[PDB]
Specification:
This is part of a larger assembly, with four copies of chain A. Chain A is mainly beta and about 70 residues long. Chain A contains no helices and eight strands. β8 of chain A pairs antiparallel with β2 of chain C, so a sheet runs across the interface. Chain B: This is Spike protein S2.
Amino acid sequence: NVFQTRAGCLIGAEYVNSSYECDIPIGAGICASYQTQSIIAYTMSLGAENSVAYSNNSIAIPTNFTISVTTEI
Amino acid sequence: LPVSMTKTSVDCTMYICGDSTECSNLLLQYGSFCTQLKRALTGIAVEQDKNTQEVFAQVKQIYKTPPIKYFGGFNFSQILPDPSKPSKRSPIEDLLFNKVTLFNGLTVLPPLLTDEMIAQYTSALLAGTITSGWTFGAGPALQIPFPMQMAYRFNGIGVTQNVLYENQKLIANQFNSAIGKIQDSLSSTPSALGKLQDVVNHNAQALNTLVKQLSSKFGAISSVLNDILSRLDPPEAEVQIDRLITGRLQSLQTYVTQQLIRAAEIRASANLAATKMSECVLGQSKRVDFCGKGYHLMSFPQSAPHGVVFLHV
Amino acid sequence: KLIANQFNSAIGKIQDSLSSTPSALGKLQDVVNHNAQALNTLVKQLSSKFGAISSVLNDILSRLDPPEAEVQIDRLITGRLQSLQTYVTQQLIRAAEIRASANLAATKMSECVLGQSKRVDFCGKGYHLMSFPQSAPHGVVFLHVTYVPAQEKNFTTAPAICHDGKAHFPREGVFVSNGTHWFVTQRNFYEPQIITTDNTFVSGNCDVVIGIVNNTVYDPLQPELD
Amino acid sequence: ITTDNTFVSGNCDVVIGIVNNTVYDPLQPELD
């Protein structure tokens, strides 16, 4: 349809309320992607919410480990 | 530290001679200057967005602050987000945003991440460093009492941990007093935010002089297209518009080159800011005079309209 | 054996990850493409007329008198000089960027490969163990081997232990209780041990520290009693 | 100054600026 964003106006994409880690940046927090069938527009999600259990006498200690190899170019 | 600059785009023909048919026909014989300039500006804009992403989007998950906000006497109220105001910024962040404030084919592309998202990123970083120490930057976040984290850091600077536990109230009071004085020091300073204001002013004056240079004649009988194309024969109109076209092309090329140089400088600054975020905020650095003056204990990030403010403890 | 197996699996997966990623080698390709594009535009701009009657010289000098030929050639000369100057300036800016990148690469080679760096998120994400270099057509690839903790567990902790009226702090580690008994462990790995005089030190009485708890501190010398 | 927070390395005639003091051994009194 037709949608209005702070970056202009977008035609041919529908606006949804669900948020994703976007791949095509449009601007002003608005992104677009292929649903798979139609092109959707949405607001970015900055990752999942994690409320760590803080306490005045509690500590978390790891019991195992992994070793990882990462590439840099 | 400044992190980015404004994203600008240009329309070649519209800036040159504002959609004039004969002038456009005369312009298409000069080659592909406009394509080169447009490509350069697009690269600059993409680089600005990448700089912001690199500096701020380092944390993997949005960590949330516990509701019981007691950390052994330490008061983080000045740097934690304030949920009363709709901006959800800390008082220091609001002070920073208030302190620094402020065509013919030219336009200003908006940034990709809004100010609210950058504030959310800063809040996540603060929550992680307050509730988990440095563990959240190397893997999963592991909770730890804040005085024990401060004892860890005192061990890191070469002081035994008992020295912390026998002076906890005094250390908390000193930290609270210093954080309280930080806001007054920022407010009373005349030019504390000089770098961001300088970046904004440089961009503004570049655009202003680019717009103003259109009134120049560059040797032609007149500056406006209509007078030249109206009261003169086309054979002379061609040579009279050639001068205007070449002068405006030269001015646009100069603007693009200065923009490229400034973008390189901003990229260097953003790389420095990203390194500081990695080493001062996500860990404890033993490098001298890097994370502030003295023996580094910790650091806290704060967002700014075009950059970052680090609070080195 | 477990560490060696994990390292072998990670190294084996590296090659598949490089092959499967579509834009893993993007930076070198962009460098090559930018150089090729600059050369292509420089070559193609010779065909422009720059306001002259023709772009080729021989026609200009063939069908025109010298007095007009000089001024008709000056336009081409100045246009081509402008094009070449623009090319050289873009090359200078790109060379500055490449030099900054090469300086970063040299620093990474010195500090990640020839040593072990304690800088956070410099030699990869996680606690840096070591690194390996690999050559590329116009660059370098670093393979950072790092250590990542996993399988965390919750515990109750105390800052100090009060025994016989004096306070005990751990020499290196944390006091940890499994619900009923207290132990000393190292911070980055769970390995409980008996709280003894060897792994603790005493400083002052046990009424100043906030959160001090009561427990026995074993001393290996006393049970000998001989 | 005890044997717990000090370590022994060689005799006391090579170091320049060495002084004389008692080093308290925490075993002799108790003696178990």
